[PDB]
Design a binder for this molecule. Structure first.
Ligand SMILES: Nc1ncnc2c1ncn2[C@@H]1O[C@H](COP(=O)(O)OP(=O)(O)OP(=O)(O)O)[C@@H](O)[C@H]1O
Ligand SMILES: Nc1ncnc2c1ncn2[C@@H]1O[C@H](COP(=O)(O)OP(=O)(O)O)[C@@H](O)[C@H]1O
Ligand SMILES: [Mg+2]
Ligand SMILES: [Mg+2]
Lengths: 141, 365, 210, 177, 277, 70, 70, 52, 105, 52
């Protein structure tokens, strides 16, 4: 029903515990299942950015991706909740820069910015403590 | 790994991890202190390690009551036998200034982390109102000269809560089973301080005000409480299919809540009246009496095993108990006690004509 | 710090230990709600501070039921053990009967149908409701309340019409001899030696009308 | 033989055995009828109560002294205490009598009972009095009826009923005194 | 956010207007269709005066018809006579006999083909669209005497008043099967009547029982139509009460959300201006 | 399914799936505009009954497990 | 017509209009009270049908095209 | 909500407005048929309540 | 309103009379005090009213009382904004009202 | 919805009393007599309680 394209930005949006990480994870597992079947140039290298999640969830995801073999094609950028606000602010840009290597060298990349609404919250904190004026829900302009 | 608590709705719809973080979300009077006291009563007695109760911003009367109950039940011993006590209390209650309520959770974490790291133990950590840490930081944050974030909290809500909650972790050298009561401020789950807490927990048990106003206790919202343990590969497919069927029947009843209100049940389909009947049976059957609530309710508490919960809800889902009335499911232990209450509910309507009670020639005995 | 404002104030109401004199302080904070919204900020702050609540409904106050105690919502879980026995002997059954009175509450025949086997719970919950109504500036000693709820619960007022239970209560308190009040106040419970004499003195009262 | 006493009060006990006590006992049409057939009375002299009924209208529940009914063996008058009868009525004129005054309804068929308590009941399906019927279309209807006669059994039974009713209606429109 | 509650208020407000219109519609229909119910009550009197009233008869075959409604905002009528149908049918089927269940109105074919499904042979509907006539009920009775049972049970709601609808069962014994046997009292009670018919008593009783079935079936569906209108007049009053109560709570919820909206937007503007000023 | 949109639609999916999923996208829309009349159950001309009796099959078809991609 | 007020009111209007629009606003208010009955098929007690035809013609009499004042 | 019906382009037929919808500009046939289409669509939008 | 109340207070305290005081639309008194508080740079309270709302109403309404010399009885017209009785201005006005006279069309 | 026909006399004495009670709440004012003709009436408290 919602067919993705290979260079397309697709937003997974919902409430808490409605299966968004499940859809992104099953996408990564299916790229592992397809990368052992296609000739070397339709292969998809996943990058998972975990913004604001706790470290137990990230460790469970690393255990899942190793016990299914998806970690051979996956990078995981993990700025957890214990990290500073600029680290969680900067982790989607770090994951996008790591995923742009495959985009710029002719390969095909897949980037998942899990909890982009937590990167916005980290950016809000980082800019409010720099005494920049707040806006809608005290977010930056 | 699962941790069975003896609570029907907890063991069925959102089971608790043995070394995981547990949240009890509540709205000032819905029963997240009675629930955490029942979890202390059920889990910490069957546990083999040490418990650390951190009282953050709660009532001092509750801390004194817990101290007297733990002295009486023997998990806290005084004097020379103090080394055989299995619980540490760390109390920063709501009479303290906001500097004390902001760091007393850190003291409770330090006492728990010594048992986890150095002692290598498996620790229980019950934190009553982890919201009060956030509220104390928001109280001191207005005088630190910060610009406020959303609805009035500090800008550093998520990072302070993360730096607190990431210290509570089952590591390789020890485990902490953390049960944290979380308070929603005005029954608003979209308030930023519980909405930030929701992402730190393995099993949320969202207690609701409306479920409590129906008389159902524990007032757990079945369609808002979640767990990472509700997965067919970790708790088995039978338990998982039963929990998902109960949630499906409750969601189909919640979809019919507006037609039943503005039109009545007589305009429902014949397949939907069966859905409403089975859902009104399973939402009385989720309720349960507690051993810590028996002092003000009178009914004795019920500990319910996991197989009894799955076997009961299988029978109510398949239709094995369409004979029994809805109030036979209310505040009973297992599926045996449903049948043994529908007996007492129909002996009693036949006990309208049993005798005429009179005690005569008695005054000089 | 508006939660801290009320928690500072209300945590000073305590019951002191025996090595601090043993004194006590009892707080009765009053919070006014708007349109019965008790999920407000200050309302839910003081609910999560105090031990219990006395919800006074605005619907029962204009239906003549005064004091308009919302019996389904108002709890008290600390003075539940600190109850006068005798009142604890009858009031548990009173609260149970008012609980099963709210299973037919305002749909007796208003919605679809009437059973006429549960006419008894309606015409008994109306008596237990009219028993608890009480005029202003006239507080009752507890030994004269447990006898009134004893007469309302054990069944000594079911043939009294609902329009005159407030007169039947004062007739019961006036016509029963005052020795049973002193015995129930001194013994602190309805003894098995006392309920026989109470049922004796409760069957020779002239309930007006009927 | 009367070895099985069925009835409404005998239905109640078997309904209290096999149907549950959740529902009150269903009503029966004999609970709405104050007048029966064998329970004596209702005559008290020379009058007797009549009940002229159509399915759509109650035409008379007064007390007459003479009722003229068009039975299939011919007309017959019902005085105060007639013999109990069940008279099948053909198309004809029912005539009620209160004394000097009379009501003459032309009926289409139906029945007429006289009961052992002196009451009578006239049960027709269409009773139009004689000013409501026109004399111009009764001859047109008989000419359209008695001429085209299908030999099929259903249509010839309908044709026999047609010529009987229209002949009685033609003999009834000019026979007013 | 704050627009969904306003559109839900706009939904429940004209739902309440709809149900207040429907209550007066059903009330006018009850007022107009009351005089026909009063007129049709006369002709069911002489047949229970003549043939009596014998519900608990031991028969070999019985056609039970439950006269339900067509449209279903009646609120507890078509299910109450389904309950009464099974309650009067379990009472009178302990002889090992066959039972045919019929429903007049298509809100009974939805409620009777799942509780007694294999004994359900006929479903009649659309009998209240134009009006109820005696030729219509006579045709329905003709399809009832297609088969020849020994009894005809008619389940319908008797229009006692605009408040009370007593469900009434009415029975018609077919002549030679049960009627000539259920009247014997040292001889017979029907032998007091002098038969003035063309052919024998076995045929005038046949005509009388078919006409009695048609008469009480016409009266049954007319009474059930008036009870349908008078129960819809009360169910729509309950729906106006419920959709006024829901609207009154949702108005308070909207007012709380509106007040919180102006407060949070103003707090945002002050927090923006205090970082600059 | 009534709110999940994609900009590409065609020319970004399996050509076999493009022939099959159009009859899915249409018939789920037929199912959704009927199921808002599921309080009465008149089952109009066995057509509004049939389209929900296919759309319920399509929604039950679209379900799948977790950590098991196809 | 229900939400439009004039606090000066009838004291500052045409006296030829003052005697005729006074019936008009009462008929339109009666038409607004009964305006839910208008889209019903089973016709009502003919007192509400009279106002439902009268007010539905009076609301057609208040129509006016643009830039042609009367 | 128009695009949720599958109708494309999802133009609101009532809420769309133009200065050219004037009988003195586009003609009294075009203007009257546009006003008639908007009238019957508003009538159906008022009937969509009682239909459900 | 303080001016009119002072003219009433001279009739109360010096003349010893039972004077009436009519305040037409006490909501406009609340609104004018809210505008004065907003122009003075003060941070607004809940829904947009002044933080001094209860005390600015109480500074007026507590001088309307019966003393040993006389009484001031006040009939205040009350407007309810957006027909919300839980709005802060009518909810703060209703804490002083001893009666209510509803005039209906 | 029904009329005065189906009102009981127990529920019609209430109508016949409440109509003249809601008439008796009305009263002519002295300040309106300069344009209404009828003089104004000052009613005492005891006269009000007795007359109601
Ligand atoms: N296809 C599926 N089948 C069965 N269960 C599922 C499926 N998808 C998700 N779940 C369950 O839903 C729960 C929530 O999953 P997930 O973590 O993907 O949602 P989320 O929105 O990322 O949660 P959060 O908001 O807490 O991050 C998980 O426990 C998972 O077991
Ligand atoms: N399991 C239960 N059984 C009976 N009553 C309960 C239960 N849980 C909560 N309650 C009632 O609800 C109230 C909840 O109080 P508390 O446990 O302090 O919750 P919170 O801390 O959220 O205010 C108690 O007063 C109690 O009467
Ligand atoms: Mg997630
Ligand atoms: Mg608490």
């Amino acid at each position: 029903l919602v067919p993705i394209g290979r260079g397309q930005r697709e937003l997974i949006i919902g409430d808490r515990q409605t299966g968004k990480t499940a859809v992104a994870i099953d996408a990564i597992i299916h790229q592992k299942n397809c990368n052992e079947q296609v000739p070397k140039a339709q292969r998809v290298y996943c990058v998972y950015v975990a913004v604001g999640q706790k470290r137990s969830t990230v460790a469970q995801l690393v255990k899942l991706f190793t016990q299914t073999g998806a970690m051979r094609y996956t990078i995981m950028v993990s700025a957890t909740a214990s990290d500073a606000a600029p680290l969680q602010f900067l982790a989607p840009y770090s994951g996008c820069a790591m995923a742009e290597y495959f985009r710029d060298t002719g390969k095909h990349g897949l980037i998942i910015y899990d909890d982009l609404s937590k990167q916005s919250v980290a950016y809000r904190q980082m800019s409010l403590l720099l005494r920049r004026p707040p806006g809608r829900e005290a977010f930056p302009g | 790994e699962i941790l069975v608590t003896g609570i029907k709705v907890v063991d069925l719809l959102a089971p608790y991890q043995r070394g995981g973080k547990i949240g009890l979300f509540g709205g000032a009077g819905v029963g997240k202190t009675v629930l955490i006291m029942e979890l202390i009563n059920n889990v910490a007695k069957a546990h083999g390690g040490f418990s650390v109760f951190a009282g953050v911003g709660e009532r001092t009367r509750e801390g004194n009551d817990l101290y007297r109950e733990m002295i009486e039940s023997g998990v806290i011993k005084l004097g020379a036998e103090r080394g055989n006590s299995k619980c540490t209390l760390v109390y920063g209650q709501m009479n303290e200034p906001p500097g004390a309520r902001a760091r007393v959770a850190l003291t409770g974490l330090t006492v728990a982390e010594y048992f986890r790291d150095i002692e290598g133990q498996d620790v229980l950590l019950f934190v009553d109102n982890i919201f009060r840490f956030t509220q104390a930081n928001s109280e001191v944050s207005a005088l630190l000269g910060r610009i406020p974030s959303a609805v009035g909290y500090q800008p550093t809500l998520a990072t302070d809560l993360g730096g607190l909650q990431e210290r509570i972790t089952t590591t390789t050298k020890g485990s902490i089973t953390s049960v944290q009561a979380v308070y929603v401020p005005a029954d608003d789950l979209t308030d930023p301080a519980p909405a930030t807490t929701f992402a730190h927990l393995d099993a949320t048990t969202v207690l609701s005000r409306s479920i409590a106003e129906l008389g159902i206790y524990p007032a757990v919202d079945p369609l808002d409480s979640t767990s990472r343990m509700l997965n067919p590969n970790v708790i088995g497919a039978e338990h998982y299919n039963v929990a998902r069927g109960v949630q499906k029947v409750l969601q189909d009843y919640k979809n019919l809540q507006d037609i039943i209100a503005i039109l009545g049940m007589d305009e429902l389909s014949e397949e939907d009246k069966l859905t409403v009947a089975r859902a009104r049976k399973i939402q009385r059957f989720l309720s349960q009496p507690f051993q810590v609530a028996e002092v003000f309710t009178g009914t004795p508490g019920k500990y319910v095993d996991l197989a009894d919960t799955i076997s009961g809800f299988q029978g109510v889902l398949t239709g094995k108990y369409d004979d029994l009335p809805e109030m036979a499911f209310y505040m009973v232990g297992d599926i045996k006690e449903v049948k043994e209450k529908a007996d007492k509910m129909a002996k009693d309507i036949a006990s309208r004509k049993e005798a005429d009670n009179k005690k005569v020639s008695e005054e000089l005995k | 710090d508006v939660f801290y404002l009320h928690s500072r104030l209300l945590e000073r109401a305590a019951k002191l230990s025996k090595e601090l004199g043993g004194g006590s302080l009892t707080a009765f904070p009053v919070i006014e709600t708007q349109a019965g919204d008790v999920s407000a900020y200050i309302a839910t702050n003081v609910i999560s501070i105090t031990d219990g609540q006395i919800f006074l409904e605005t619907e029962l106050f204009y239906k003549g039921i005064r004091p308009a105690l919302n019996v389904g919502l108002s709890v008290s879980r600390v003075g539940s053990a600190a109850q006068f026995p005798g009142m604890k002997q009858v009031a548990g059954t009173l609260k149970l009967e008012l609980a099963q009175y709210r299973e037919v509450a305002a749909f007796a025949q208003f919605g679809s149908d009437l059973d006429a086997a549960t006419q008894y719970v309606l015409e008994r919950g109306a008596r237990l409701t009219e028993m608890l109504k009480q005029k202003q500036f006239a507080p009752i000693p507890i030994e004269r309340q447990t006898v009134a709820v004893y007469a309302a619960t054990k069944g000594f007022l079911d043939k009294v019409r609902v329009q005159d239970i407030v007169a039947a209560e004062e007739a019961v308190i006036s016509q029963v001899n005052p020795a049973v009040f002193k015995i129930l106040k001194a013994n602190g419970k309805i003894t098995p030696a006392l309920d026989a004499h109470l049922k004796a003195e409760l069957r020779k009262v002239k309930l007006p009308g009927a | 033989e009367a070895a099985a006493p069925a009835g409404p009060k005998e239905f109640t006990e078997v309904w209290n055995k096999k149907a549950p006590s959740t529902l009150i006992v269903p009503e029966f049409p004999s609970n709405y009828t104050a007048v029966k057939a064998v329970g004596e009375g209702q005559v008290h002299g020379d009058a007797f109560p009549v009940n002229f009924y159509t399915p759509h209208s109650i035409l008379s529940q007064a007390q007459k002294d003479t009722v003229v009914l068009p039975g299939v063996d011919g007309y017959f008058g019902v005085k105060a205490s007639h013999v109990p009868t069940i008279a099948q009525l053909k198309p004809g004129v029912v005539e009620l009598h209160s004394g000097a005054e009379s009501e003459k309804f032309f009926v289409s068929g139906g029945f007429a009972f006289v009961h052992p308590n002196g009451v009578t009941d006239i049960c027709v399906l269409e009773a139009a009095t004689l000013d409501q019927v026109d004399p111009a279309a009764v001859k047109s209807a008989l000419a359209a009826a008695s001429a085209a006669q299908p030999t099929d059994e259903f249509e010839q039974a309908a044709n026999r009923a047609a010529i009987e009713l229209y002949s009685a209606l033609e003999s009834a429109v000019e026979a007013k005194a | 956010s704050n627009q969904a509650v306003k559109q839900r208020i706009r939904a429940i407000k004209n739902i309440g207007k709809i149900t207040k219109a429907m209550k007066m519609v059903a009330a006018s229909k009850m007022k107009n269709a009351q005089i026909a119910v009063e007129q049709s009550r006369g002709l069911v009197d002489p047949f229970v005066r003549l043939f009596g009233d014998f519900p608990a008869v031991n028969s070999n075959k019985s056609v039970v018809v439950a006269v339900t409604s067509d449209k279903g905002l009646c609120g507890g009528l078509n299910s109450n006579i389904t309950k009464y149908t099974r309650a009067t049918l379990a009472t009178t089927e302990s002889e090992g006999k066959d039972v045919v269940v019929v429903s007049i109105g298509d809100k009974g074919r939805s409620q009777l083909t799942r509780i007694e499904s294999q004994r359900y042979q006929l479903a009649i509907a659309d009998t209240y669209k134009v009006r109820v006539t005696f030729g219509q009920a006579s045709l329905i009775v003709e399809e009832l005497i297609k088969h020849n049972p020994q009894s005809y049970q008619i389940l319908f709601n008797k229009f006692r008043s605009a408040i009370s609808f007593k469900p009434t069962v009415a029975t018609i014994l077919s002549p030679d099967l049960l009627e000539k046997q259920l009247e014997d009292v040292t001889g017979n009670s029907l032998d007091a009547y002098d038969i003035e018919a063309s052919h024998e008593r076995s045929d005038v009783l046949r005509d009388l029982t078919e006409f009695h079935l048609g008469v009480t079936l016409y009266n049954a569906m007319l009474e059930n139509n008036c009870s349908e209108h008078a129960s819809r007049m009360s169910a729509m009053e309950n729906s106006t009460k419920s959709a006024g109560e829901m609207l009154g709570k949702l108005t308070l919820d909207y007012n709380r959300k509106r007040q919180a909206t102006i407060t949070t937007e103003l707090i945002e503007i002050i927090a923006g201006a205090s970082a600059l000023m």
